[PDB]
Design a protein around this nucleic acid. Sequence first.
DNA 1: CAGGCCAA
DNA 2: CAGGCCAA
DNA 3: CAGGCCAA
DNA 4: CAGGCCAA
Lengths: 99, 49, 50, 429, 49, 84
Amino acid sequence: LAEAASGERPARWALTTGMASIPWEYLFFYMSPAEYNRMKNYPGTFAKSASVRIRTWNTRVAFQTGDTQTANATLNQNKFLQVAKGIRSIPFICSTNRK
Amino acid sequence: HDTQMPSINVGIRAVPKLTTIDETTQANSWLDAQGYFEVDCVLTTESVD
Amino acid sequence: GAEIYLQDYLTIYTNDARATTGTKILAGFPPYKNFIEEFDASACINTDVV
Amino acid sequence: ATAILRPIGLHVEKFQQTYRKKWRFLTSANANVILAEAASGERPARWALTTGMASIPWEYLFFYMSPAEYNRMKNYPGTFAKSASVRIRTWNTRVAFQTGDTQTANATLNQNKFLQVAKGIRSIPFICSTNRKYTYSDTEPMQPTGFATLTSYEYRDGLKIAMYGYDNDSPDFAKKPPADATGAEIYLQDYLTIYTNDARATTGTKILAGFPPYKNFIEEFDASACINTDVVAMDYDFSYAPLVPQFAPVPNNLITQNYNASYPAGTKNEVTAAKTTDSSQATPPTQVRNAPRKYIQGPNADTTFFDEEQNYLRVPIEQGGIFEEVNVETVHDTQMPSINVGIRAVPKLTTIDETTQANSWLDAQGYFEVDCVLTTESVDPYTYIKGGCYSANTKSQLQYFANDGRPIAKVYDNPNVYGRMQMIKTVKP
Amino acid sequence: PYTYIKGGCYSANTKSQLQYFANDGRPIAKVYDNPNVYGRMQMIKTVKP
Amino acid sequence: ATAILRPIGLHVEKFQQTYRKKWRFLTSANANVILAEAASGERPARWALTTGMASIPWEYLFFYMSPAEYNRMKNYPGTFAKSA
DNA sequence: CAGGCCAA
DNA sequence: CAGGCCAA
DNA sequence: CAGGCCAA
DNA sequence: CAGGCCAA
C-alpha cells in the first residue's frame, strides 16, 4: 500500500500482514475500570510483572470465495499461523501496527 | 536504563483461492480465514503505606 | 467471554523513491519473514503459541 | 641451523559464502493434452504432450541469492559456485469440490490425488522435451489449448521479480510484493512438455512411432499420503561455475620477451574442443579444437557475459566446458539434472460415453515448499607487493565466444541432443 | 550484512559510526607521537597528506 | 506443529583476514648525550637525553600489510583490526 | 531410478 | 529466536 | 615489569 | 616447501 507524504512523514510503501497486535503492554488489558479506579486509591503502586499466554483454537477457512464464475470450493486447506515476537524492536525493520 | 516491552503479533497467513492465475506472481484472491486466539494475562502490582 | 475482533495488524514500511530527488535507496523490503515463526495451523488446534 | 626464512608462499584469502532461500510454489494439475506446434523456420511440425509437472529453476543463481547478494558478490572476483542443494516438501494438495458445470451433479467428497516427480528427464537422450508455458481454455481452466509466447528468459525474470519485487522507484512497485519478505506462495507456469514428430505433411518415409512412454521415467505417489513430506532432495557439486572472473595476473608480456612462447603439450589435451553433432545424420559428429574464445580478465578482456550478468537468471550456474584455464587442465561436459514436480489432473466425476481419456478435470493445486542452499568461494591472491590483488597467470580464464563477439554459454532451455545440453550464443539483455 | 532484499549490503542503523571532528572539518584521531599527558595519548587534528 | 518458518534472522557474512610480515632492522648503539632543544612557540626550552633504543612502529597498519593488501582491504567495508 | 548414453 | 543493537 | 596512574 | 598451476 502506498502512503503519501504528509508533513514530516515521507512517502513510503506499506507491506500489510495478517499478524494482529496483542496490546499486552497496556493496563486495560489486565484490569477492569473498577480495578483501575480502586487502584487509584493506593499511592505508591508499581506494576511488578505482566505475563501473557496465548492459545490458538481451530482456524476457520472459507469453503469457497463466492466468485460464482469459478468452481473454487474445496475441502482441502493449507493453513498457517504466524507468530512474531519482538519485531517492534528490530533496528532495521521499520514497522508499526495499523488498521 | 531505557526500557521496552517486546511486541506480540499473531495471525493467520492468507489462504489463496483455488483459481489458476495466468502469470508467475502472488495470488490475487484469498479465502476468508479467521484466527481464534485465547489470551490469558496476569498483572502483578505492589504498593506501600 | 465472547470473542472480540482485532483490527490492528503489523505493517512493514519501506521508502517510496518515485518522487525522490538525488541518490535513491532502492533496497526494496527487508525479509521480515526471516524473523517470524510460522506453523501449520491445522496442527496447532488448542495449543499454546505465545 | 635456525631458519630465519622459510617458503611460506603467497598470501591468499579464501572466502566461503552461503545463500539460502525458501520458496512456496503453487502448481496447476494440467491435463495431458496433445497440442500441435506448427513448423517455424528450422523448427519442424511436432506434437506436444502437456503435463502438470512444473519446472523447478534450481539451476539458476536468482533461485538462491537476492539482487543485493548478487550485487555484493560482484565485488568478489574469483568467485566460484561450489554446491547447490534443493529440498522440496509438498503440503496438502487442494482439489476442487465441483467442476462448476451446472448441468451435472459432479461434486464429490472423494478424491484420487497423485503427485508426479521427474528427476533428470531433460537429459534422457530419446525423450525430446522442454519446459513450456501453456494457454488454457476458459470452460476447462486446467486444459492447455496452446502455448504462451513467454520465453524462458522472460519466465525466469518474472519469477525473479515475484521473488524479490521491484525497485522502490518503480511505478509498478505495488504489483509484486516480494516473496523473500512475505513468504507468500508463487504460482509456477512452466511445465514439462513432451514432443514427437508431426507426420501429417511429412513427405517420404514417415516415422510413426507415437510418443515415448514418459510415464515409465517419473515417480508418482498418492498425494493424500504425502502431506508435509520431503519429495525431492538433490545436491549438485559444480564442476566449473565462475560467477565473477579471477583477479587478472600481472601481464608477463610487460616483463618478458618470452610471453608468446610454445611448449609441448604431449599427448594431453590442454585446450578444450567443441563437439558438433547432427541428429539429422547429414553431417558426422565433429570435434574442433581451439574454438574462438577470449579472456574474461586481463589486457584484452571481454567481460560481456559477466557485465550482462547472464549468470543471474538467463544462463544456468554451471558452465563446465565453456570456460578454459591456461594450464594443464581436465575439462568435461556438464549438466544439472532437471527437477519437475506436479499434480496429475483429477478427472471430473462425469460419465463419458466413449472408451478414452477424461475430457473434463477438477481444479487442483500442488503446494510445494522449496528449501535451497548455494555455496560459493572466492580468493584474494597477492602475487605482488603493491597495486592490489593479482592472481597467477595459470589462473587466467577464457570463455568460448562466437565470431560476432557474443559469449557462448550453456543453456538448459532447449531439448537435449544425444543427452547433452547445447552451448548457444548469449543474447544481449 | 543484508538487511534488505535489494540494492546491495546494508547494515543496521545501530552499526552507524561517528568520528570526532574539529570545528574546521579536520578529523580528530589518536596519535602516539607526542609525549603522554597523565599517561594518556592525546587526540589531535589530522593533517591533510 | 511443523514449523514452516523459523526466525533464521539476517544473512551476515563475516570474513577474517591475516596479515604477516618479517622485517630485519639495524639499530645504532647511540650514546646517552644531553641535547638542548630551544623554545619554539608553545614548546618550552628543554634538555633531551638521547638513547639507542629504536622505536618499533608496530602500532601502524603499514607494519603488517602491504599497499596491495591495504588497497584490497579498502573494498571490505566494516573492517576492524582484531589483534596485532 | 539425478551429473555429458544405457541396453555399460 | 522477546527487554534499550547484533554481525556482541 | 605492556593496555587510558601506581605509590591501587 | 622441487617435476608442466595452486588458491587443487
